[PDB]
């Protein structure tokens, strides 16, 4: 039963690793538009001043 539990743990680990992979893949562009907005905002503030 411990080996069965370990196998279930491994399956959960692999599926959750795929989940974190897709989460990172969708989340990196969020940081991308965050940086783009940062550059746009600072450039706008500099031009305004």
């Amino acid at each position: 039963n411990q080996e069965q539990a370990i196998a279930s743990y491994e399956a959960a680990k692999e599926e959750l690793g795929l989940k974190i992979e897709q989460i990172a893949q969708e989340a990196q562009p969020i940081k991308e538009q965050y940086d783009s907005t940062k550059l746009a905002l600072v450039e706008a503030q500099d031009e305004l001043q």
């Binding site: 539990a5 974190i20 989460i23």
Partner: protein, 48 residues
């Protein structure tokens, strides 16, 4: 989103730690059962 990702990564790390603990424990337990199964049973079984 970064907090959620690091949460999922931390859960992954904890799952890996649980897997390692379980596998090392079951390996030690299998060693113990292999050592103790034939401690005295072999003589009686072969005799029988």
């Amino acid at each position: 989103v970064k907090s959620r990702f690091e949460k999922e990564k931390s859960n992954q790390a904890e799952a890996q730690s649980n897997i390692d603990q379980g596998r090392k424990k079951v390996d030690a337990l299998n060693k113990t059962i292999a050592h103790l199964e034939e401690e005295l049973t072999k003589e009686m079984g072969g005799d029988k």
